[PDB]
Amino acid sequence: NYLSQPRLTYKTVSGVNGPLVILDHVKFPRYAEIVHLTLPDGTKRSGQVLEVSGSKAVVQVFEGTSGIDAKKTSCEFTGDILRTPVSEDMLGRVFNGSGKPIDRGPVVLAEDFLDIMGQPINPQCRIYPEEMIQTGISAIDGMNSIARGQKIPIFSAAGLPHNEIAAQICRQAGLVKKSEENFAIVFAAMGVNMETARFFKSDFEENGSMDNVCLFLNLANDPTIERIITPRLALTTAEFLAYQCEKHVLVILTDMSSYAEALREVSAAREEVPGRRGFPGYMYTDLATIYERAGRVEGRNGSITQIPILTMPNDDITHPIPDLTGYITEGQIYVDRQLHNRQIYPPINVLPSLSRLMKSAIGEGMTRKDHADVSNQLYACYAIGKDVQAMKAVVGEEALTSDDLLYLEFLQKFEKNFITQGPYENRTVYETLDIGWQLLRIFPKEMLKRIPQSTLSEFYPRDS
Amino acid sequence: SLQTSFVTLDEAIKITNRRVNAIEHVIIPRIERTLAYIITELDEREREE
Amino acid sequence: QVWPVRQVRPVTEKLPANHPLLTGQRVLDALFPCVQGGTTAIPGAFGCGKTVISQSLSKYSNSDVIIYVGCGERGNEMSEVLRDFPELTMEVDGKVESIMKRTALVANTSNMPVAAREASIYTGITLSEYFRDMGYHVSMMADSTSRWAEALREISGRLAEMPADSGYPAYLGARLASFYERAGRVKCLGNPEREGSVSIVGAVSP
């Protein structure tokens, strides 16, 4: 069972170069092994074996290589790869991007130790997604609805409120409460500035939701290997909570754009040639190894649902990071600069947004029977309303028909009441659908062509 | 009043339909050819590098 | 027996394709027919409704055997195929039978090894050529050849090869040509005189 053998400590440093220390005379070197370095002044650092060849090992040090020398620095080889302790005691805790506690609680007692690389889920064992995850935000739950076992990115840009949206989803998310303690969140944040990291930690304590949440913070000036490890600690925790403790886990991964910046740096440290657009050629297989740690599985009552969050340069959707993410994930939620400039929050644009699994999450016994019809009709009215608003500047408001003036009234009240929501306002799917009907009632019921007569008969009229 | 309107309105339709055609047949294709050249030359710089 | 996936299985003769691959659809079968031994492409995209091709081939074609390849598909899409196919049935001699009595699936999600995602169509065509050689008519479907080409690109990137057209390796068009050249009607090797065919449908995602 146990590893049992005593550790070897070497003073055989051959060279130091960039983030890398090279050692010789190492006994049967193991690839990806964790090692501990002690510096000439007694300072301690750690690193991982990046390559092996004969008696030589090269170690990438997580902290700097400064103050290291060939004579006095010692390196202790631990005999094993990186494994994380894991338990249900991790809900209510804050960790850094190496899994160390930063909440003044004690260190984790393991229920198990797991290899952070994981293993791929067998395609035979993955069952299709089903019921809703309720985020509490009407532009998502009402029109871009999220299924248990889905993976769906938020696409954003620098200076837009995507961290305020992520924090609101984390505070508000759950199951629909139709007619649970089996819901949990793993929140992971990569390359976070200290202002943003203090906001996440403060907002979840202040608004009292930590008992559902495991939080991993990696800051903008933490080691870039801890950024590579951070999604893997988060997903190794979500896999224990979902597929051994039977929870529904929501995973929020924050700036996969920051993750790719570290991946490009570790690739450069291996002396690989830069790939297409400057990212590693293997970046699809790498991102797919994160995003496919998701789903429902046969014979176990838990699931993992992922919401990756990304920042795009130039607001350009065709860059490798959002483009490769689109080939792996199943939808997008789009955060818009124009709604943000118009002082609307959350500035989610429903016309380019899509959830590809929405039909599997919504309807009788999962939300409400009218949800699909209301979602289809609200999209159809908004797409016409934006087209009437454009022609109003060409033809003038006196050339508009009475029906154009109804779409022009709906457009204003949709954005002020459905899309606009407070950062601490939580709407169930039922409240979202009722706000949806208040807007549809602006029209004569003959206009509502996407809604069948049975749904119009049950829901168009007000009642005491 | 109807004939001074009609003869003035016929002129403005022709000028407008000519702009809709020029944007569709002349202006948009020149932009698309430019944009296709840029992508082709950026692939060359990447292969040289 | 054991056979290399990258070697074409030999035949007595390769023959022109003469007989329709009927689907039971009025469009397709009348306006845009395919032959047994033919090659077809379809657009692989979300809203278009691909499943009518896959299910008409599986339930209603004059194929004797069906090979389906997923070649780097999304985990929830691959799960939908593997759920749905066992539930499909057909009527044979006045009795209802499972599609899985005449079907084999190759399945790969986007986090399988890149070597598997690229090998997938060579595994699926080698299985198809084995049943052709028994004198069966086979239809092979590839769920997206674009996901296969991206795996081929990643492998050339690991090998640090010259990036040619849009970053794809120099051999891409030759690999596609040599793959689709395995489709056809044949006179089989060996003594009991027989004919077989393999027909390829490859989805592609522009």
Side-chain angles (χ1 to χ4, degrees):
Chain A
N1 298 10
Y2 301 122
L3 199 65
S4 301
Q5 296 297 111
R7 296 179 178 175
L8 286 158
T9 304
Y10 305 88
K11 285 187 175 176
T12 60
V13 174
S14 306
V16 193
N17 179 45
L20 310 184
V21 176
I22 299 90
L23 292 103
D24 199 0
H25 314 303
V26 182
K27 308 295 176 162
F28 307 107
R30 185 192 296 286
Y31 180 74
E33 168 172 5
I34 297 300
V35 314
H36 302 304
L37 297 94
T38 304
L39 264 67
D41 67 11
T43 306
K44 289 178 184 284
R45 292 181 176 159
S46 63
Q48 186 166 39
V49 179
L50 190 74
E51 161 182 14
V52 301
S53 185
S55 61
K56 284 189 175 177
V58 52
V59 175
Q60 182 159 7
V61 192
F62 300 166
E63 304 90 349
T65 51
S66 62
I68 298 186
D69 66 54
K71 285 287 182 181
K72 298 183 183 182
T73 319
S74 66
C75 191
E76 176 191 324
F77 276 59
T78 66
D80 199 20
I81 65 168
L82 182 55
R83 304 182 201 269
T84 186
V86 71
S87 57
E88 279 197 292
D89 299 323
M90 296 188 78
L91 298 184
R93 304 300 308 274
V94 194
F95 302 106
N96 78 14
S98 72
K100 189 179 181 179
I102 68 177
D103 59 9
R104 305 180 179 169
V107 72
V108 174
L109 296 192
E111 291 179 69
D112 218 328
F113 294 111
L114 300 185
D115 167 14
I116 72 163
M117 302 306 298
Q119 292 173 338
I121 296 166
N122 184 340
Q124 182 66 3
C125 294
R126 211 189 313 243
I127 68 184
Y128 198 72
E130 201 183 343
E131 306 194 53
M132 205 177 74
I133 295 297
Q134 181 178 252
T135 66
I137 298 171
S138 294
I140 304 175
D141 291 352
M143 290 183 68
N144 301 278
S145 178
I146 302 178
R148 285 177 212 176
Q150 185 168 12
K151 48 187 193 304
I152 180 162
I154 306 182
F155 289 173
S156 192
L160 303 189
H162 54 265
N163 290 333
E164 291 73 18
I165 292 162
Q168 181 165 8
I169 295 167
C170 178
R171 286 185 278 102
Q172 294 183 346
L175 313 187
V176 316
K177 297 290 187 171
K178 62 192 188 175
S179 180
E180 300 297 70
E181 71 273 27
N182 293 316
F183 182 75
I185 310 186
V186 182
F187 195 104
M190 284 92 65
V192 192
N193 68 22
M194 178 83 275
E195 297 309 304
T196 303
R198 201 189 312 103
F199 168 69
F200 293 144
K201 190 177 183 295
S202 181
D203 200 44
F204 304 162
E205 291 172 12
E206 174 63 8
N207 305 281
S209 66
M210 282 305 306
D211 57 306
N212 271 355
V213 188
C214 190
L215 175 62
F216 299 84
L217 291 165
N218 162 259
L219 271 60
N221 67 341
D222 286 343
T224 54
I225 280 185
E226 290 186 10
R227 201 181 305 153
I228 302 307
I229 289 165
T230 292
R232 292 176 174 79
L233 293 170
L235 289 166
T236 303
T237 307
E239 283 172 356
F240 178 88
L241 291 175
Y243 309 130
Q244 301 179 43
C245 304
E246 298 197 301
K247 303 191 197 294
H248 299 290
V249 185
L250 178 62
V251 184
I252 298 162
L253 304 179
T254 319
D255 281 296
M256 299 300 303
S257 312
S258 300
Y259 171 84
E261 187 225 59
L263 184 72
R264 185 172 67 186
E265 182 182 307
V266 175
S267 177
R270 292 182 174 285
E271 304 185 276
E272 297 170 341
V273 188
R276 187 66 174 160
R277 295 283 296 261
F279 288 95
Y282 55 91
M283 187 168 76
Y284 175 95
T285 294
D286 190 72
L287 291 175
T289 300
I290 287 171
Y291 300 149
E292 298 282 40
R293 296 175 83 166
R296 310 202 303 141
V297 302
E298 192 182 43
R300 314 196 184 182
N301 293 274
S303 65
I304 299 173
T305 309
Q306 298 195 17
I307 303 177
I309 303 185
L310 300 102
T311 294
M312 309 178 294
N314 297 317
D315 310 353
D316 181 7
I317 196 158
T318 70
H319 181 279
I321 292 171
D323 190 42
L324 299 178
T325 298
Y327 292 135
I328 300 157
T329 62
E330 61 259 354
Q332 65 281 337
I333 298 149
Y334 198 88
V335 183
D336 170 40
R337 195 176 299 281
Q338 293 194 355
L339 286 168
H340 188 60
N341 287 352
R342 293 177 191 123
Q343 312 297 291
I344 290 156
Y345 172 92
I348 291 164
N349 188 2
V350 295
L351 295 178
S353 301
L354 178 75
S355 175
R356 287 168 53 153
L357 271 49
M358 169 157 190
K359 293 181 186 181
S360 72
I362 74 180
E364 184 167 33
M366 301 192 291
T367 60
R368 198 199 267 161
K369 67 196 294 188
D370 63 327
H371 191 162
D373 309 339
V374 173
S375 176
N376 290 340
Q377 192 62 69
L378 287 174
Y379 189 99
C381 298
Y382 188 60
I384 298 162
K386 293 301 299 175
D387 181 61
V388 173
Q389 186 183 47
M391 97 166 73
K392 185 174 71 77
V394 172
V395 308
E397 77 279 14
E398 300 193 312
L400 295 182
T401 73
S402 303
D403 293 3
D404 295 335
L405 297 175
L406 290 178
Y407 288 111
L408 200 77
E409 177 169 17
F410 171 91
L411 177 66
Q412 295 172 75
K413 296 183 183 180
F414 178 83
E415 293 188 332
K416 287 182 178 182
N417 299 277
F418 193 88
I419 302 297
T420 302
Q421 175 170 354
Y424 301 90
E425 177 184 323
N426 187 358
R427 297 175 184 165
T428 59
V429 71
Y430 302 111
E431 292 158 74
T432 292
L433 289 173
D434 298 346
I435 297 159
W437 278 110
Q438 289 165 27
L439 298 168
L440 292 179
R441 288 172 189 141
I442 293 167
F443 299 103
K445 55 189 294 286
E446 288 70 32
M447 304 276 283
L448 305 187
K449 292 177 181 180
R450 306 302 301 274
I451 308 190
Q453 174 69 332
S454 311
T455 301
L456 291 175
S457 300
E458 290 183 40
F459 296 98
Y460 183 95
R462 279 176 291 261
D463 198 3
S464 182
Chain B
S1 306
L2 303 177
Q3 293 191 351
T4 48
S5 299
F6 177 86
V7 177
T8 303
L9 185 60
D10 177 27
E11 171 182 296
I13 290 163
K14 288 189 178 85
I15 295 168
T16 303
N17 286 349
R18 196 169 295 179
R19 289 184 70 181
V20 175
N21 292 345
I23 296 163
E24 181 168 302
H25 293 294
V26 183
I27 300 159
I28 285 170
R30 196 195 299 136
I31 291 163
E32 291 191 325
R33 283 188 292 260
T34 307
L35 187 56
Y37 178 78
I38 294 162
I39 290 171
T40 305
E41 287 297 310
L42 293 175
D43 290 349
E44 293 302 314
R45 299 304 87 72
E46 185 180 77
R47 199 180 307 104
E48 290 178 63
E49 179 173 17
Chain C
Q1 69 178 252
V2 175
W3 188 266
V5 298
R6 298 199 169 85
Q7 292 197 2
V8 183
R9 284 182 58 98
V11 298
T12 295
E13 177 171 33
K14 192 176 181 182
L15 294 171
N18 289 173
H19 194 294
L21 178 68
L22 297 175
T23 70
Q25 304 312 294
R26 285 184 287 268
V27 73
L28 321 187
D29 298 354
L31 278 70
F32 306 109
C34 190
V35 289
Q36 289 179 329
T39 59
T40 305
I42 74 171
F46 170 58
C48 301
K50 316 193 312 181
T51 57
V52 75
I53 307 302
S54 175
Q55 295 186 356
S56 302
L57 262 58
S58 303
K59 292 190 291 188
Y60 299 123
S61 71
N62 57 357
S63 309
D64 300 315
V65 170
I66 303 291
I67 307 296
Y68 190 96
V69 179
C71 41
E73 314 316 320
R74 297 182 180 72
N76 290 320
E77 291 185 67
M78 194 77 258
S79 181
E80 204 189 26
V81 178
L82 295 175
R83 179 195 69 183
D84 293 354
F85 257 76
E87 301 184 348
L88 302 177
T89 58
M90 62 184 168
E91 186 164 28
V92 191
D93 299 316
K95 186 171 182 172
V96 176
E97 293 274 33
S98 183
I99 286 311
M100 295 299 283
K101 285 187 180 179
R102 73 164 190 186
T103 306
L105 311 181
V106 168
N108 296 276
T109 57
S110 69
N111 69 329
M112 306 286 277
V114 69
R117 306 192 311 254
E118 186 258 311
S120 62
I121 69 174
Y122 298 104
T123 297
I125 195 65
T126 300
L127 293 170
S128 303
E129 288 193 291
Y130 183 62
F131 291 105
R132 175 202 72 190
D133 294 343
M134 303 182 199
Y136 291 123
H137 296 288
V138 186
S139 295
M140 183 191 153
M141 168 71 76
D143 197 348
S144 186
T145 58
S146 298
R147 296 298 90 77
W148 172 85
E150 285 161 18
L152 191 78
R153 183 163 65 178
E154 285 182 276
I155 290 159
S156 75
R158 284 292 194 190
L159 292 168
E161 300 188 329
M162 182 277 295
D165 287 287
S166 307
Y168 290 99
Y171 44 76
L172 176 78
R175 296 294 175 93
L176 289 167
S178 184
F179 169 73
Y180 281 113
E181 188 56 57
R182 298 218 204 172
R185 185 173 70 115
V186 308
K187 192 176 288 163
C188 305
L189 273 191
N191 277 324
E193 195 68 55
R194 66 201 183 274
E195 295 193 356
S197 71
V198 189
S199 325
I200 315 301
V201 189
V204 70
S205 302

